[PDB]
Design a binder for this molecule. Structure first.
Ligand SMILES: CCCCCCCCN[C@@H]1C=C(CO)[C@H](O)[C@H](O)[C@H]1O
Ligand SMILES: CCCCCCCCN[C@@H]1C=C(CO)[C@H](O)[C@H](O)[C@H]1O
Ligand SMILES: *[C@@H]1O[C@H](CO)[C@@H](O)[C@H](O)[C@H]1NC(C)=O
Ligand SMILES: *[C@@H]1O[C@H](CO)[C@@H](O)[C@H](O)[C@H]1NC(C)=O
Ligand SMILES: *[C@@H]1O[C@H](CO)[C@@H](O)[C@H](O)[C@H]1NC(C)=O
Ligand SMILES: *[C@@H]1O[C@H](CO)[C@@H](O)[C@H](O)[C@H]1NC(C)=O
Ligand SMILES: *[C@@H]1O[C@H](CO)[C@@H](O)[C@H](O)[C@H]1NC(C)=O
Ligand SMILES: *[C@@H]1O[C@H](CO)[C@@H](O)[C@H](O)[C@H]1NC(C)=O
Ligand SMILES: *[C@@H]1O[C@H](CO)[C@@H](O)[C@H](O)[C@H]1NC(C)=O
Ligand SMILES: *[C@@H]1O[C@H](CO)[C@@H](O)[C@H](O)[C@H]1NC(C)=O
Ligand SMILES: [Cl-]
Ligand SMILES: [Cl-]
Lengths: 605, 602
């Protein structure tokens, strides 16, 4: 019965023999808690979208080889079902590289266990891991195909491959053959690339339909002409029409005018083009999922994106303006729209210092350290995300300050340095490769190294992390390393072992509790946590990793806190890992505190 | 162990041997859905109140003699246990008469089966009814007394008896004796009356502590001197310090300024007096629970009262201002206050005509009518609330207008008249005692009569309802009546068995709310643009009466717990006067859900 195909004769899609054009919005299920999937999807449907687009991040689902996550917030099958049940069609973008301001572009870090791997190429090791991943992911997607009764109408192969240097056409042909093998010969397979022959040159492949992406800054005619070069026949498609843009820590929050998006959307729609709004809701990079760009600049925790639906799912002016545009072309669903969620200001919650990272080494690294003559990377010590502590002793007296240095700029990405429990300051990828330290010969030198996000775009996505090259002290290479991978996630969930197992300050864990009453229909509510007086770190509430805060740089001050991780009667435990400076010294305990507010601050003065 | 008592030395209470002063607010559990009891009580606690005060409406718990409701929303025991759990003490006002802008001041309508009953007196049948009720209620209250480890610290006997004409002291003494028999000798019993010798005369009794009530317009020194004249020693107590005032359909919405409440509150607290804010939350008169005053004027569905918490439980400017006054005397609890609930505008919902009242008599009256030579009252035909259809046939032809009148003003309280299914207009208690009708001889004359709420204050509380005296057509007494009591509640629940003016009719429609949305359903307000007068149910729950034609209330409060996501929600409207549904345009036959209340329209 069920068919979805390209009508080449008629520059169109056919959906069960009928002319079809899609109006889609990007939503990433990995950036929205499952609790709220239905809420966002319904808001998307009510805007008049007939389809949604999503990425499948490979590393989100296979964080260790052969160890899969497809349940709860990782249940892509369920997400796709929910979309179908709401009558939305799905454009699937399964990678295996997705870019997406997401850690390493979705690629698993354990691929880097072969140091010389050439990612996104016919490197046989890269291919064997890709093939094994597709043999798991694609048969799950097969019954979700439009023709087998599900919502999936088109599937993207790779992501803007033409923007990458390797230009390996055997890789692309390999992906095509495997996608076909698992999904069959009917499913529409496409590529997406920047709208210019120079990008199309290496990204397009015969047998995969060529689509382009472009934003409100682009000349629409020119963009679609570049697509028409590779596809003289078939529908016009903008796979990523930018509703906003990404951010970086320390840069002003990106915004795009409502009128600019509305007018461009109108013109695209007026050409009979199919179009996807990237992003429709952006959401959040929880835990360590954010990516980065080269030269090294990490994206922050919020992926608000200035999208039509805000980070927390709110209806914005942009949302209504885009809905109004769509209404000019198609009948939008009737009835009231699910609302922006209520937000609640829980107020100030005092914390207190529990333990330094040094003191918690036993619980953080319960299998003990790896010893090495020279430093090893995160990947070599089997750590992908978070922090690794590197330890050695001073091989000479440093009563006078001696330069600690990474001559090849190999601190990836930030190191918090202490000598005998005295913090010495910070080393920084690019910015500061030398730090003066003092202390006695034989003193314990500690470097707490944070992976701030693997680069997700450009040539340097093989971003190893850790001390990736030697450190010197007064110019001599430092040797004899004791290296502790830190299981911060487990440790925080056991309250650093406390619950069993059923200027600068030292990096440390600060904890505090707050209660919310039960039997109140409208509590808990969503909230935003803010860190007045803190500097940089990670935050958990009830062991859920909300992401990184960095009020010292901005633009993001608050972090989003979804209500479903909050409990009533039972105390809610906040854990803060502060890396640089905590406001918790003086008499005043009231300074050692966070505050929950009812409005986000993601773009301050 | 636990003790609560009046100390006449320090002119205060002693709670466990220590000086105690209560700062209380009124909340009536019968006017707030149980779903929201903890929310309202916690907001009260967060205001700095150390106590709540409530009435027990007898008729809410004993709708027929020997038939009791103490479950779910009628669960007074649970409500008091809940106040206790949250650290609130309770001042209990069990009546038997409570006044309270509540149907018949809480007295059950079945008392009026004795037509000559003198309510609120030593009338032996009245006493015997009361005594049986106290024998069911007060043993439930005994374990909830402070001395037995519950929250109840004082108990009011009767309610402003000094404002009633009877002045029957044997009645008050009987109550005191029965309360003592069921509750024991330690419980602090008290009375409440207007703060003037003329009100205290018949209201005060020896052995019952005398308290006064008064609002923001009163001289506080004088108000307390009149109490002191009755109780030279003991706590000063304002049992009802008005934060607002009641409403009447067709009168402007009552408001009292925050600055006036805060100012008087501070003044009363500063004197060391115990005080109860009436109302702290007013809530809603759902179904037919509203009262009325004489000369006949019904209170509306909303009991918002201009209280510190709004009808729907919202934190108002008045709320924060009184909290700040309480803070000057007492540390209030720490932490954030529960929020005003989110409100959602579900929008416009179209309804269709189901059946006129005329066509649904099988379903409304499955027992068949009662035949009578002259008209019978609601009570005589065994109905208390709602609507009764009175039917006769025209004796002479009426081609020319003929006066249809109740020469003794005996339509209690409003009648919707049709002749052979042609609406004629409306007869109204105290207002329109004559209406002209036409029709042919032998025509069917129908009067749908509404009990608009039994008077709850003054001498005329024995308010029977129905056609209480004869009707005349062209001066001739109309006789031979066929009288149908109407089971509106059942019929509405059954979707009427099918699981200028217009004829009284039921209109129904439906709306869906999506499931798996964390923040729906939400509270809302229903509005009836184009409609005139009627009753509304949602999912068979009777939300009350609407009357946008008179105001000041236009919207009715709809609590979210009655709304579902698994199946469509049904709205049923019974429109009594004129429905916007004739129209070629079915879109006009519709109600609207909005996210803000309109209870003070001009
Ligand atoms: C600092 C320079 C910015 C790098 C630009 C990123 C590459 C653009 N390609 C497309 C656009 C975005 C932007 O949100 C996403 O990364 C998409 O995944 C990518 O396909
Ligand atoms: C026509 C207006 C006459 C109103 C008379 C009010 C009766 C005074 N009684 C006290 C005050 C009020 C007002 O909310 C309540 O009815 C109380 O139950 C009552 O004790
Ligand atoms: C965009 O480019 C096309 C050329 O293909 C041109 O016709 C059109 O005028 C351009 N729009 C401008 C200049 O804004
Ligand atoms: C470290 O100290 C030396 C003094 O020996 C000074 O020249 C240099 O600027 C300092 N380096 C840094 C990175 O502060
Ligand atoms: C460390 O220094 C030694 C000696 O130069 C060199 O062989 C080794 O490759 C360096 N290791 C790293 C990780 O930079
Ligand atoms: C915070 O709550 C957790 C869970 O009860 C507990 O283990 C920890 O000791 C608490 N501390 C305080 C101050 O409440
Ligand atoms: C109230 O009455 C007293 C006399 O009893 C008088 O002195 C006082 O000023 C009055 N107070 C106010 C506020 O009117
Ligand atoms: C009824 O109609 C008669 C004759 O038209 C008129 O005299 C009388 O005033 C009317 N009464 C009312 C109450 O309308
Ligand atoms: C109605 O009229 C008859 C005859 O006068 C009289 O007996 C009876 O008391 C009246 N009934 C009522 C209900 O007024
Ligand atoms: C149910 O909902 C639709 C939408 O308003 C309406 O057309 C229909 O009449 C309703 N069904 C009923 C009232 O049985
Ligand atoms: Cl996407
Ligand atoms: Cl009360």
């Amino acid at each position: 019965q069920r068919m979805f195909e390209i009508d080449y004769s008629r520059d169109s899609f056919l959906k069960d023999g009928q002319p079809f054009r899609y109006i889609s919005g990007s939503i990433h299920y990995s950036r929205v808690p499952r609790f709220y999937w239905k809420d966002r999807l319904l808001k998307m449907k009510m805007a008049g979208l007939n389809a949604i687009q999503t990425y499948v991040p490979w590393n989100f689902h296979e964080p260790w080889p052969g160890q899969y996550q497809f349940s709860e917030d990782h249940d892509v099958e369920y997400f796709l079902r929910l979309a179908h049940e709401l009558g939305l069609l799905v454009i699937l973008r399964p990678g295996p590289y997705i870019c997406a301001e997401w850690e390493m572009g979705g690629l698993p870090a354990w691929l880097l266990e072969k140091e010389s791997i050439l990612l996104r190429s016919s490197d046989p090791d890269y291919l064997a891991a890709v093939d094994k991943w597709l043999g798991v992911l694609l048969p799950k997607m097969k019954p979700l195909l439009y023709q087998n009764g599900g919502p999936v109408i088109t599937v993207q192969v790779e992501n803007e491959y033409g923007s990458y240097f390797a230009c390996d056409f055997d890789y692309l042909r390999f992906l095509q053959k495997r996608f076909r093998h698992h999904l069959g010969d009917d499913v529409v397979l496409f590529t997406t690339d920047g709208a210019h022959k120079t990008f199309l040159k290496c990204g397009a492949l015969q047998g995969l339909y060529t689509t382009v992406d472009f934003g409100t800054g682009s000349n629409i005619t020119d963009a679609f002409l570049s697509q028409r070069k590779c596809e003289p026949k078939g529908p016009l498609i903008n796979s990523e029409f930018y509703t906003g843009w990404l951010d970086h820590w320390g840069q002003p929050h990106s915004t795009i005018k409502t009128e600019a998006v509305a007018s461009s959307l109108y013109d695209i729609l007026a050409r009979g083009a199919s179009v996807n709004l990237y992003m429709f809701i952006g959401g959040t990079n929880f835990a360590y999922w954010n990516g980065a760009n080269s030269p090294y600049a990490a994206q922050p925790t919020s992926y608000d994106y200035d999208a039509p639906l805000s980070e927390a799912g709110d209806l914005t002016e942009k949302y209504f303006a885009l809905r109004n545009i769509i209404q000019k072309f198609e009948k939008v669903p009737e009835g009231p729209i699910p609302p922006s969620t209520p937000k609640f200001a829980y107020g100030k919650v005092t914390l207190e210092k529990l333990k330094t990272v040094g003191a918690a080494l036993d619980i953080l690294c319960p299998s003990g350290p790896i010893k090495s003559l020279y430093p090893l990377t995160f990947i070599q010590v089997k750590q992908h995300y978070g922090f690794v502590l590197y330890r050695t002793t001073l091989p000479q007296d440093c009563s006078n300050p001696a330069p600690l240095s990474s001559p090849l700029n190999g601190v990836h990405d930030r190191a918090y340095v202490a000598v005998d429990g005295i913090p010495q300051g910070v080393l920084e990828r690019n910015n500061v490769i030398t730090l003066n330290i003092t202390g006695k010969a034989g003193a314990t030198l500690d470097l707490l190294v944070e992976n701030m996000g693997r680069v997700n775009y450009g040539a340097y996505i093989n971003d190893f992390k850790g001390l990736v090259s030697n450190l010197t002290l007064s110019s001599n290479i430092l040797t004899d390393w004791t290296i502790f991978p830190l299981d911060t996630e487990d440790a925080v969930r056991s309250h650093l072992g406390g619950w069993g197992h059923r200027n600068y300050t030292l990096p440390a864990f600060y904890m505090g509790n707050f209660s919310i009453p039960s039997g109140i229909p409208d509590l808990p509510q969503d909230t935003f946590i803010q860190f007045p007086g803190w500097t940089k770190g990670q935050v958990w509430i009830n062991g859920f990793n909300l992401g990184r805060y960095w009020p010292a740089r901005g633009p993001q001050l608050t972090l989003f806190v979804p209500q479903h991780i909050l409990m009533t009667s039972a105390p809610n435990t906040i854990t803060v890992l502060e890396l640089e400076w905590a406001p918790c010294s003086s008499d005043d305990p009231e300074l050692c505190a966070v505050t929950f507010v009812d409005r986000p601050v993601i773009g301050s003065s």
